[PDB]
Amino acid sequence: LMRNIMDNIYRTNQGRSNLEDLLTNEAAGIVRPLE
Amino acid sequence: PMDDEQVLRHLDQLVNDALDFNSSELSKQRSEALKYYFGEPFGNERPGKSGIVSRDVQETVDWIMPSLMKVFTSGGQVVKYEPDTAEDVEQAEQETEYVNYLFMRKNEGFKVMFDWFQDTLMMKTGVVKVYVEEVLKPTFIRKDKKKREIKVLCVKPENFLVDRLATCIDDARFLCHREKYTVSDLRLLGVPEDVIEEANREVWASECYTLLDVDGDGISELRRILYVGDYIISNEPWDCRPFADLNAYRIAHKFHGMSVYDKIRDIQEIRSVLMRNIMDNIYRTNPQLSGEVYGMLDRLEADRGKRTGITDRTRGAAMSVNQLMTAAEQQIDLIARMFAETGVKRLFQLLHDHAIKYQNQEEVFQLRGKWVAVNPANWRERSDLTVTVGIGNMNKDQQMLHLMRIWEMAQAVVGGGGLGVLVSEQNLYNILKEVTENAGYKDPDRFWTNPNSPEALQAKAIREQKE
Amino acid sequence: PMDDEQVLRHLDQLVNDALDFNSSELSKQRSEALKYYFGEPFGNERPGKSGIVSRDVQETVDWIMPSLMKVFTSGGQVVKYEPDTAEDVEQAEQETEYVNYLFMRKNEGFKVMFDWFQDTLMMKTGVVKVYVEEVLKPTFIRKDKKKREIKVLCVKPENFLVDRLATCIDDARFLCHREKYTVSDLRLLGVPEDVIEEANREVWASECYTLLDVDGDGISELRRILYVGDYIISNEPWDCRPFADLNAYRIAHKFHGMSVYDKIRDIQEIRSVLMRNIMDNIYRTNQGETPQLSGEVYGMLDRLEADRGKRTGITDRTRGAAMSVNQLMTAAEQQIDLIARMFAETGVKRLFQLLHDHAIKYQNQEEVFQLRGKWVAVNPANWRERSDLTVTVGIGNMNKDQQMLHLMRIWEMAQAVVGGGGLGVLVSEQNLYNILKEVTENAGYKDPDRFWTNPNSPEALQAKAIREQKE
Amino acid sequence: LMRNIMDNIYRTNQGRSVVLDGQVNLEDLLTNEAAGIVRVKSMNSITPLE
Amino acid sequence: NERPGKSGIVSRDVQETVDWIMPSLMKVFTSGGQVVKYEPDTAEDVEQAE
């Protein structure tokens, strides 16, 4: 449950959105996407 | 193997590659982060129309600063050691007070800590460097000769080149820290000539920590190189890298993590564009539209809520125990946890920098008495239990709960049973002392001690027996 | 090396560059901030229609200034030392009382620090300068000769040119302070001629603090130059820059920090435009078929206060068991606390500066701190320490909370122990002295109203040791 | 009755959110994970019963 | 069972159980020499039993 809670916090921080978008939270800036 | 000159060009090539990669990528990303934080137009605003941009990370930072201040800047209980119970009081709390009374309260207060948080939040990399300086000015009583002090500073993370395959503090094979180190420092070093770069010639310098083997053998420990301008350097065997390289989020295995901008970029974009559309609608209307957009605007604050500020309200039986379940399940707790463990390494590093040789000074920890702090044990372990996802129960929750329960129990026992049979004045000392840390007056304001003392025998053992 | 005139032109070039950059950028920023503060039209107010502007930063200042006034301008207990335990009663409280009884109560009270907060808030930078003068007018008993004294003043931060690559007080390579120093001051200096600039010719002068070396060697220490008009100057090596350059928000590594306007400009804009839209709606409904609107807009109006609620003013109501302990967790984690925090440490540097400025030589003055007696503070130790813990995010327990808590808890404990155990086992009159004393400083009557000392005194032996024993 | 007390604590501290499919397709994780806000997709009904 | 690429943080629970189970034993046992009584034949208890 604790692992799932922290993983949920992580995925909410990124969120499902050529270089695989860099997990949506890396040195990307602009994507250039379902909620 | 017998490397004396090829190390110079190898370090130059490493510095150039790190400059290219780190500079380009990280600088562009942090420029985007800062332009988001300050709210200037993104550049996509067509001319002749307002480019109003609403800052959505500024309030996030303003909301997270007080929580961080409360969790860190509250007492010296941030990090403990808890060694073997039989003999623990010899340096565990003593070294804890040493570190939290030197770093805090003697190393520019929390300014280094505040800038470290800012670096790990907006600058994307919170890392500081710890090193030594020589204390001077004796009386020639107050003969302060050969004294030296170990301090910490920001590494100007714009100039913190490092190999990108580190993913951890003790994994980087090439650490570059770039500084000014002006002509005065050059004269102090003793270099007679100059480099390509008025006395103040804004010269530039760098320091490289990298594991190398220049002695004709296997790979040795770290090497510290004062690579300034491909000139006279200060090469030295280096044992431990003094850095912390925060990622602020327990990100995946990479040297640096994401940032507040990385997680609020979409929110700021949507908020700014929908504000721009709303003011455009108002300007053109002067068919109509509805104010329901403002309604969605509400969850836009909850959008900053959806990542960090989950308390949409000001602060979202037994009257809401544990500060209403940790300020409404604020995940800053778990974030603090990783913060703490990063700082754990930091403390250990500075502990080493004081465990080798610092000075003969003594601690003013509520009372006189501290042996020379030049040879403490490292203990090879720390803790962050009383701050975060560990024990981490803060002041007032323990205050009400513990005080009420143990106080009612103790007064009931005193009325019915007595004092010595259960928890007594020796341990009612602790009962009151935990209240003292609940209010911050531990030793001096109230002694309250009376465990076994010359006043105890005459008061608790002589007259109290013959009363 | 052997620079006597090239320094003049170099300083002039630095002054011109600082003028350009600082003037343009910071002056336009502070002009916009002032227009927002004064409710001036934003420029989008089209003619023929009302352009009413609603001020929002003003009331924010109105809430947050008094909080600073209580947390700073309340007694001399704000800032301390906690030095070596043995050598504290000799100087620690003595030196702290001297420095605060000088700064407050002898240097225009709160006015200098009030304007300091004003400058760091509205116009993005709060900085003051510490300087010295000579005391005169003896009886020629009361011979007030050769006395020299230390003041501090607002630098008129509109005239505080400095290199932008400092990001800290002790990092600037060129500090410029512009003043008038009229012709009376020039004749006091002794210059016979004038510059480009009736006796008072509104002349302008400047002072530069910068590291240089005119001795043909490596870079020397700070140099103080009285560069007025490229004329007779007062060149002198300097030791410490007496400036504090507050930023009020501890922004990222740059010399100046963003202001309340820089964060509430959007809120002021949206409030003004929505209320102007409200009055335009009222107009068009008065003349009139245009469909009406709903009052739900006003509902969103409400959260704009919550906007000031969410930024700085979380206390939307009057104030945001045991009746809301710690003043309800400091009004639900009030951020002004941490604000005071960094302001405090800024004063810390100033508290060092004046201390050194006083550690050299001031006079043979004594203190009236609860008693007569204070040694000559012209040769103290700096102690190389300064502490601002008990007024902020640290211990910082404000008066009433710790007041009621400590008093009721220790009083019930004292009565219970005296009845059951007795005064001997727990706290005795030796520490009941301190028991009374925290109340004394809570209500501000420490020594004079109530002495209550009785540690070991001539009255102690006759009262505590003679009659209390033979009773 | 220990089991009933802990089940009652479970249902009181959980909250049965009656949400349709097509929005939050991943079972809410049996409402056992921490994110903060419910949200569906484009609608705004949301039916959490206490 | 921790898949690669994600943190393997584990929350400890039995540690608190141990930390709350030794102190009670410490009070109930390591307090005086009355831990174990004999009460043998009523012949001589203070001379040999105690």
Contacts of A12 in chain D (CB under 8 A): 35-36
Block residue for tokens 């340096």: B91
Contact across the interface for C218 and B298, Cβ inside 8 Å: no
Chains D and B touch (3+ CB pairs under 8 A): yes
Distance between B145 CA and the closest CA of chain C, angstroms: 16
Instruction: List residues of chain A with CB under 8 Å from any CB of chain E.
Output: 2-3, 6-7
Block residue for tokens 């005193």: B414
Contacts of D40 in chain B (CB under 8 A): none
Best probe of the D interface among A9, A10, A13, A14, by most D CBs < 10 A, is A9
Nearest-angstrom CA–CA distance, B297 and E21 = 52
DSSP C27: I
Instruction: List residues of chain A with CB under 8 Å from any CB of chain B.
Output: 6, 9-10, 12-15, 23, 25-30
Nearest-angstrom CA–CA distance, A7 and C413 = 49
Nearest-angstrom CA–CA distance, C412 and B36 = 56
- For chain B, list the contacting chains (3+ Cβ pairs, <8 Å): A, C, D, E
Helix (H, G, I), strand (E, B) or coil at D47: strand
Block residue for tokens 């122990």: C417
Nearest-angstrom CA–CA distance, C297 and C323 = 36
Contact across the interface for D35 and A7, Cβ inside 8 Å: no
Distance between A28 CA and the closest CA of chain D, angstroms: 24
Distance between A35 CA and the closest CA of chain E, angstroms: 23
Q: What is the largest CA-CA distance in chain A?
A: 36
Report DSSP letters for B284-319, one per residue. Answer: HH-----THHHHHHHHHHHHHHHHT----SS---TT
Q: Which residues are CB-neighbours of B245 under 8 A, at least 6 positions away?
A: B125, B126, B127, B162, B166, B169, B255, B256
Contact across the interface for D36 and B305, Cβ inside 8 Å: yes
Strands B128-134 and B148-154: antiparallel
Nearest-angstrom CA–CA distance, B197 and B109 = 34
Block residue for tokens 């007024």: C391
Distance between B302 CA and the closest CA of chain D, angstroms: 8
Contact across the interface for B440 and C395, Cβ inside 8 Å: yes
Nearest CA in chain A to B264: A13
**Helix, strand, coil shares, percent, chain E, to 5:** 40, 0, 60
Resolved by: cryo-EM
Q: Which residues pair with residue C148 across a beta bridge?
A: C134
Q: Tell me the structure's resolution in angstroms, rounded to a single decimal.
A: 4.8
Contact across the interface for E7 and B389, Cβ inside 8 Å: no
- For chain A, list the contacting chains (3+ Cβ pairs, <8 Å): B, D, E
What the block records as the tokens of B259 is 């940032």
Distance between E33 CA and the closest CA of chain B, angstroms: 15
Block residue for tokens 């600058």: B123
CB contacts < 8 A, A to E, total: 11
Tell me the CB-side half-sphere exposure of residue B334, using CA atoms within 13 A: 21
Contact across the interface for B334 and A29, Cβ inside 8 Å: no
**Helix spans in B39-146 (H):** 58-72, 92-106, 111-121
Nearest CA in chain E to A11: E6
Q: Which residues pair with residue D17 across a beta bridge?
A: D48
Nearest CA in chain A to E1: A3
What the block records as the tokens of B78 is 């941030």
What the block records as the tokens of B388 is 């975060």
Helix (H, G, I), strand (E, B) or coil at B121: helix
Q: Which of residues 1-30 of E touch B (CB under 8 A)?
A: 5-7, 9, 11
| B52 closest CA partner among B275, B297, B264, B295 | B275
B328, B312 Cβ separation under 8 angstroms = no
Instruction: Answer positive or negative: Cα dihedral of C453, C456, C461, C464.
Output: positive
Cα C158 to chain centroid, rounded? 18
| C240 closest CA partner among C179, C169, C177 | C169
- For chain D, list the contacting chains (3+ Cβ pairs, <8 Å): A, B
Name the phi and psi angles at C218, rounded to 5: -70, 170
- For chain C, list the contacting chains (3+ Cβ pairs, <8 Å): B
Provide the terminal-to-terminal Cα distance of chain B, rounded to the nearest Å: 85
Nearest CA in chain C to B467: C421
C148, C361 Cβ separation under 8 angstroms = yes
Contact across the interface for A23 and B252, Cβ inside 8 Å: yes
Q: Which residues pair with residue C178 across a beta bridge?
A: C206
Alpha-carbon radius of gyration of chain B: 28
Distance between B379 CA and the closest CA of chain A, angstroms: 29
Contact across the interface for E5 and B250, Cβ inside 8 Å: no
Q: What angle do CA B194, B195, B199 make, to 5 degrees?
A: 50
Distance between D39 CA and the closest CA of chain B, angstroms: 10
* Helix orientation angle between B58-72 and C336-359, rounded to the nearest 10 degrees: 70
| B50 closest CA partner among B260, B217, B273 | B273
Block residue for tokens 């003004």: C272
